[PDB]
A paper describes a structure:
We chose the Glu494Ala mutant of AxqNOR, which primarily migrated as a monomer on a chromatographic column, to define a cryo-EM structure of a monomeric qNOR. TMIX, which contains two of the three FeB ligands, His537 and His538, is very distorted. Regardless, they cause more pronounced changes of the dimer-stabilization and proton channel-flanking helices, confirming Glu494 to be a critical residue not only for activity but also for structural maintenance of the dimer and active site in AxqNOR. The single mutation results in active-site disturbance of nonheme iron ligands, culminating in displacement of the dimer-stabilizing TMII and the putative proton-transfer channel flanking helices TMIX and TMX, acting to create a catalytically inert monomeric qNOR.
A quinol-dependent nitric oxide reductase (qNOR) plays a critical role in the survival of the bacterium in the human host by combatting the host’s immune response. qNORs belong to the broader family of nitric oxide reductases (NORs). NORs are largely found as the essential component of anaerobic nitrate respiration, also known as denitrification, in the bacterial cytoplasmic membrane and catalyse the reduction of nitric oxide (NO) to nitrous oxide (N2O). Whilst cNORs are pre­dominantly found in denitrifying organisms as a respiratory enzyme, qNORs are also found in several pathogenic bacteria, including the Gram-negative, human-pathogenic bacterium N. meningitidis, as an enzyme that is responsible for the detoxification of NO produced by the host. High-resolution structure determination of N. meningitidis qNOR (NmqNOR) is of importance to provide a framework for developing a knowledge-based strategy for the design of new antibacterial agents, as well as to help to understand the chemistry of NO reduction, 2NO + 2 H+ + 2e− → N2O + H2O, at the heme and nonheme iron (FeB) binuclear centre.
Numbering used by the authors: 2 to 743
Amino acid sequence: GPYRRLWFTLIAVLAVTFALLGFYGGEVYRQAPPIPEEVASADGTRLFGRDDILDGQTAWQSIGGMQLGSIWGHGAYQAPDWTADWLHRELMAWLDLAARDAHGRDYGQLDAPAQAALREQLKAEYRANRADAAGGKLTLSPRRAQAVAQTEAYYDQLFSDAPALHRSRENYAMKENTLPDANRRRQMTHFFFWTAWAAGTEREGTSVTYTNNWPHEPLIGNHPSSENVMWSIISVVVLLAGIGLLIWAWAFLRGKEEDEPPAPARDPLTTFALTPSQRALGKYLFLVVALFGFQVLLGGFTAHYTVEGQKFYGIDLSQWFPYSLVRTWHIQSALFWIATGFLAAGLFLAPLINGGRDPKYQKAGVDILFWALVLVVVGSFAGNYLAIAQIMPPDLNFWLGHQGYEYVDLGRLWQIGKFAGICFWLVLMLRGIVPALRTPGGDKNLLALLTASVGAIGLFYGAGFFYGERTHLTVMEYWRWWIVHLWVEGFFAVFATTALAFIFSTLGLVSRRMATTASLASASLFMLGGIPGTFHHLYFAGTTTPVMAVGASFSALEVVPLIVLGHEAWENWRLKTRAPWMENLKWPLMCFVAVAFWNMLGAGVFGFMINPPVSLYYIQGLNTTPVHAHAALFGVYGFLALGFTLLVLRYIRPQYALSPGLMKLAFWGLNLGLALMIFTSLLPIGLIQFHASVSEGMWYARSEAFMQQDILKTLRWGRTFGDVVFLLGALAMVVQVILGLL
Ligand code: HEM
Ligand code: HEM
Ligand SMILES: [Ca+2]
């Protein structure tokens, strides 16, 4: 900063947060539920081992991973989640094989005090089944061994083209094989047994399991405990005492000197000239909206994989395009186009903060970065296509294929290329910011914090390394939930708040210090408080008690920093028409209105409805997390990047008219279509399934016996009537930007 002090203080935030990453990966490591060495059966024969568990984990990553269904509730929703259908089916196989050698009959054919005496023998056996003090053994009973090997045949038939199971495979939306080799089936069933055994086993000393008795399961007695509701109400106190103290600290710092700055009659951005490196951004804005159209079309294709079969009113080509591939594409291209629009907006604003001046050979660097981004997208999608089609031996699929985890499934070579592209954009950022801190001035307060936050976003992406493939599941989900604790909570939030502060300072609708306070707030809440909200999702996958104590109180802390609005766009907008050129910026602003609207709809109401764990116990893995994702991601950041897209369209084609009249439809159709496919189809399905999962159980909500009750069948067939409206709105937005590019 003054003597390269502030720029050098960047390493200290990285070091503190990386010590916090190291110390919590250290506790998760070995604080995890253990993979035992070998499955010791009681008769005297051995079973499979950690090599088979690791290779079945790799085979499960090869077939889609969390894009078929889910393990422990995090993932996909149109297939039964492996941890609960296996648990319920293993339980029903055990009751059949326990009624066999005692009565010879079925389960439900017996009376209820007999079912209760077998369930109390079940809780005499399942609440104590461990190793030799993490000694690697099982001591598995032969009755449980015959039950696991009997329910093993079901999943050997679910992926081996069984002709009697077309009533289940496409009804669960898979391709006819999904895994052609037989040892791979034998290892994927061993992996499923381990994940549903680590649920069905109490923790050492305590009476709680390793995943805190994850499904609602009365037949094993999985009722959520006392400290669950205690820490839930503690989290509610933390949420309420966070919002109020932030409003109190905002109100007791809004006491300005009433400066009242006058708005100039022109726009200080358009008064300066245009570099060719600015004029070379039409290709970026084409790639942004091209990937957006690709993403909505793919989304309509997974919509038809949800309602109907794999043939699409003809003959099926889904043998080359399964459900996991189109969901990976929908998920990765969504994150990619949302990130590239903001990356383009940042590289737009970066020379203009520098008085328009540019570094040496800038347009060529912008072009190499552009072709690098298109190359990484196409290679990642080709790797996903080659990996799901089993055109890859199980050795480079982790490196050069679909990795298998939501939002991180890109291959490690393509992840290295994406990290290198983000560092090259970092280079173009420091080449635009440096020249503006080397000048003698007094604006060193906000800009050093902005440098540390941009350095943090990317230099915490060194955490996309430091995990291999052959790792434990929960350690990975600590790291998978570390990614999305910054991939949306970081430079979508913090970058779009500071870019919003730059826009509202240039329009003069902020006091140019509340922007600083907000930026300072949205900076510090994520650089100092960015670690521990991961523990609101890891509490259901391997906590101990001080981990649960930190993760309930210290993970509700991410709710509060969002909205500077309410203090603009109701009074300042009331003071509108001061400047004539605002009629060109009516629509970019409208997006900034809608940004506020789904922030009181996505996270403002449905984010704390689903946050505390006794709420989260019955819903994690149901159709209320996509309710949160769909409303939250396009509802906030899907409008932030198209408002900036629209805004840099009006700043690179100023002579080209923005052609309104259709853009009102493209805006006021997109939001309403998103609200129609969110409030009318997905949320009622989630509440009826939620009522059935608290009534009957978690296994029941994902079964095909329940999802084909012809009410929620017609309600997801009626999902389509808002989706076509959203596609029409997106189509009109796309044609508007293409006609603007001329
Ligand atoms: C309007 C066209 C769209 C369609 C047809 C569509 C389709 C879908 C469907 C069906 C799901 C849930 C799948 C399931 O229940 O298993 C889903 C989830 C999701 N969609 Fe979309 N989508 C669309 C638009 C968008 C947009 C604009 C974004 C953001 C850029 C987006 C990002 C997501 C995300 C992040 C999820 C969460 C998936 C998960 O975590 O399981 N989608 N989409
Ligand atoms: C505004 C920025 C945010 C966005 C864009 C966002 C988006 C998402 C998405 C897409 C998911 C689904 C992850 C998955 O695929 O499994 C998710 C998970 C979740 N979010 Fe957020 N979120 C945000 C902030 C928040 C806030 C502020 C809260 C609560 C205060 C919250 C609570 C949750 C919870 C409890 C889950 C778990 C759902 C699951 O496991 O599927 N999020 N978020
Ligand atoms: Ca998911």
